[PDB]
Amino acid sequence: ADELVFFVNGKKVVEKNADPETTLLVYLRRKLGLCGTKLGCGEGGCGACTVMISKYDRLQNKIVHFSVNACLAPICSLHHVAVTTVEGIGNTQKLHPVQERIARSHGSQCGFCTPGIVMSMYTLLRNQPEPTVEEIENAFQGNLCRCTGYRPILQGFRTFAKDGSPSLFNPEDFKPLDPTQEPIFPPELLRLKDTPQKKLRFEGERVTWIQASTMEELLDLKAQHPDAKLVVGNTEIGIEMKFKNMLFPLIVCPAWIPELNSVVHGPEGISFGASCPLSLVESVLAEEIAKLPEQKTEVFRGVMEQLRWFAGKQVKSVASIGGNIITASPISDLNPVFMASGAKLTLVSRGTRRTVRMDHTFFPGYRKTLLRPEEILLSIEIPYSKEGEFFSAFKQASRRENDIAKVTSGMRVLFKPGTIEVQELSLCFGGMADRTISALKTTPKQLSKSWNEELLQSVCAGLAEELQLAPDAPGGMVEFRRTLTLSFFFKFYLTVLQKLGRADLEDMCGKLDPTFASATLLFQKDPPANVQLFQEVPKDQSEEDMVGRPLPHLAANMQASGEAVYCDDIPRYENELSLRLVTSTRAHAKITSIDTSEAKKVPGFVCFLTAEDVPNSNATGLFNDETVFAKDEVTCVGHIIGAVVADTPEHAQRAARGVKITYEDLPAIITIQDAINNNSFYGSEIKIEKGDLKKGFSEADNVVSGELYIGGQEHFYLETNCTIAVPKGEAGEMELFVSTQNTMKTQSFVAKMLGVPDNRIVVRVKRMGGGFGGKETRSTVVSTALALAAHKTGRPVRCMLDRDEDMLITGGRHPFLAKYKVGFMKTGTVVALEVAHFSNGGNTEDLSRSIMERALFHMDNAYKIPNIRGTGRICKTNLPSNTAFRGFGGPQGMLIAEYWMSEVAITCGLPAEEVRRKNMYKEGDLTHFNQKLEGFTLPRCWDECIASSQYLARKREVEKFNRENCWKKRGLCIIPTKFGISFTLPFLNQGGALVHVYTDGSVLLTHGGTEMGQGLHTKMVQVASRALKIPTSKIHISETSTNTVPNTSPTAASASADLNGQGVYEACQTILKRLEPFKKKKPTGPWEAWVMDAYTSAVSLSATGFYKTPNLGYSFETNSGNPFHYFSYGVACSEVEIDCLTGDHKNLRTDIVMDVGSSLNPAIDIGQVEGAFVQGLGLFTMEELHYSPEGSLHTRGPSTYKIPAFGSIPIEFRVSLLRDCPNKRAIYASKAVGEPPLFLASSIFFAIKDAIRAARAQHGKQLFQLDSPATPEKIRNACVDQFTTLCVTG
Ligand SMILES: Cc1cc2nc3c(=O)[nH]c(=O)nc-3n(C[C@H](O)[C@H](O)[C@H](O)COP(=O)(O)OP(=O)(O)OC[C@H]3O[C@@H](n4cnc5c(N)ncnc54)[C@H](O)[C@@H]3O)c2cc1C
């Protein structure tokens, strides 16, 4: 009646008090303690929560398997299914092939996404034990990885496909797959399939769930309670409940009802039950497309095209067709298609049944349909196309707001038979209004007309008038969206001409020029082809000496098995409490009142912490200008005001909603331009200048000025910020488990806030699911709050941020505005450069000044400039404080450099590769800050990359492509980089290690570095194993702790292997020195005997080690002293193809040559080049944050913030590590690698810029603007043509 019964990894679970609000993810993690399955977003975008469901399909009489997002799956929908998690398929004692292959192929860095990807791949193999390469890629459309750049995951998994320097891994050593050895379908569920299913009722704290067994039950419940909210896949309702704080006290799930799941062929088309998952629609229509003649399947193919780039497998397996229709989002991709095809909907209640052909009337208002409150949608008939009936579907792949302002379209034409004269014409659009619309003013005009140029121009003129948007229209991108509607129609117009041509008419139609053909092609991925080149170690190097060898990340197997422990995977103490932050909804305001009266009514509520609860100091942050908790004034949307403490996260979340703040607004400073004209800055102008600007400009042949805007970036570490604080009840003692790159500042900020000495506070980091600089300082806003809750209650307290919280609160990369003026000769030789930089720092200083320093240190990028002036000013604004992000001001400084350089080349009429080459530093040159460039490997990186990329021959093919294609264009660009290695604050260039050798010969090592997926622990073990001359297997690193190594620098500035490697090395030398006498006396006898002899001789088997980078210290005052220990160098050539009509593009090929000295670990270093490059690809081409005019972040999750996906990476992706370039002054001649490759993705940006120019010359001013990121909006709008001109002005 009442019991919930399902299986998890083959074990029966009986839940007697199922709460309808409980997700499967919460149940697995908090009820069953299976923490392999992760929380990444709670929104269905990221796949970190992916698990497999197995059930008996009654309607097909078979056992089916499908993946779902556990974060959105109500347990109440899972009666009598079997769940399989990552723990179900294998472990480190016996890894599944999927697990083994992702680990051994270097497909797991931080490891947080690994379980989810493993389960997506696993599920594919249960459905198709021999998939194509294409099926394998498609399996991950719902899986995001922030670290790997995807290449190693696809390459490792490519071994499962039927259609498949040393090597980074060996596929021959992989255990083969035996599909027979997968776990049995629970026989109990096969026995129960025979029992008839009856109605179930679950009653939660707030919500009642009725699982209906028949159409009669459902319609009865809706007739007596029209308020009953239907839930099917929960992919929309789940979001409304979790993120829009909507509550539906009565839910009915009709997913079991056969009539809602049926597929019926009829004379007019195929009828699908409303609750049919989109994956079933997809599989049914695909069989129909393959079997039926083309003339019948035009609408089917439009549906399939919309479903191609539509969430992943996890969403489509449970997302219902009916759910999509009734949600009635303005940006549904299906509703425009159903509307344009006039699909027939059947609506029923108790005692009524009606039919409506979908038209403009079906959607009368925002998120409304014409259903009555007691009706449900039974079914939708997707029609066969008739003879002379054509359909195209189109969509903007670039989303900015939750549910508006993304163009998506269905388009249909019916011709009078035998003719090219229009009988019917339907053009329907999402993203152009608060509902799906039809262009009903434009289409009637076209009836009778022939399908020709006069129709094209009439429809375009019509759409430009009818689809008007106010310049402040919701969702922005007004010109782009308008342009897309015409551009989509043009594609349809041309596509119809093609189809017409194929039909052998009496009246001849109009032929496409070959240069227009590529305009109608549907997206097609060619076969991936990846190359990784590195250097073999010397032949005489011991097999036990792993330095320079591609040893897998030490945790890779455990990460793939879901056994690796991240903060929130740590079990709860029974007395443990949960914290939830309460943040400002205003950019700048006084707090006038706080009312907690509603918070207090929430079960399990404990307290609301505010400034007045802070024992000692409310002043925190790097430069002591931040509140722990807001006092009288809030200074950004996201400013932490206080913290709810309750028994559970859900109770904390409800209580936080019941904290009402009243505000009195104050003048806000939001943008860089706001800050400039209010003189609102963090300290004074920073400046570097050399030579004589006046003389430089006055002697140049040409001068070019301009401006550039570069948007910021969210880290999107797949593990959000998380802290557990455990008060020990003695002497103010507290222990914190933190996802942080900075144990020292965590400890120090907690101690100061509480007013206790540092020696009472321990911060422990096992690993992070990613960091990328966003946990270098901003993690402490969570730590501090949670430390306070722990102190006040005397109980352990935990807080893991949800994605929307984390993105809003913790800031990101700094946006930059630059104004430049460059003076150059006709040869392209730069003689003068002046750059004013402005950064948007937000509402605390944090690292903003150091970041501006690093931009200024790299404003030269690779180029010697005799006369040069750079200034930087950091803007103070009412925004979340921006912080460190991999590159730390470098990529911003360097993009500006490459931007005016691109204009230098164009202005001169000279090849860009030549202009860059002749301006490049040479060995021994001084930089603008007077540091000498020794071991200047950049020229070799360049020469190698030119040859290996075949750049000159590929330039010719690009030019050829461009002459042959009017509406697609290609671009090709090769970009170098210099990146300075060391913290800009000299004393931070220090590190420590501590080593123990126990009496069994095993070694326990620790150092100040934190693991966040970069393989630092792996490297340090490799180092320790060489230093001590024992195998890696005898050495273990458990974690990083302030009570084993104190006063550590943050894990940052790419320098952690350098600093800690030396520390580790020194501690090992100390141990060796002490073992030397025992070695001498038994030079053969083994390690273990030396150690036991040392012990029983009372010799210390414990040592510290320490290192400081020598001889650093720059003065801005005298422009002297070396800020860097050395420089990293690299070069990337990238090629793109843009679609001039949509602003979409493909990354066709990227070739990278990177100097990492003699790599400690080429697998890991190649991993880092690829990951860094792909994060840069994101910065420069996708990844736009949007803010309201009043400074509220609107982009708070993967629905609206698009980080690179599996499908985003360069189709051919080649990486080489430079041979024979030892770097004497770092550990074992290695170089740092983490940050330097990031900027090389600018090569995709400038290739796009080259493509845009070619498009502009096709129709038909030379230095056009391309801001960063170069999104579809910016690319399309810059591709000026008849459509952009019409939309901007008749
Ligand atoms: C990560 C992600 C990506 C997505 N991407 C896209 C995309 O690219 N394009 C796109 O168009 N959509 C997209 N969606 C939306 C998705 O297609 C819809 O959420 C889904 O189809 C809703 O189906 P459901 O069964 O999950 O509905 P639920 O969330 O269970 O219900 C949705 C609504 O429909 C009502 N309802 C459901 N069935 C019936 C019925 N038979 N009769 C009457 N009312 C009913 C419910 O009461 C509810 O109001 C995305 C969703 C997610 C989570």
Ligand code: FES
């Ligand atoms: S946590 Fe479920 S999709 Fe991201």
Ligand code: FES
């Ligand atoms: S390894 Fe994939 S998110 Fe870090």
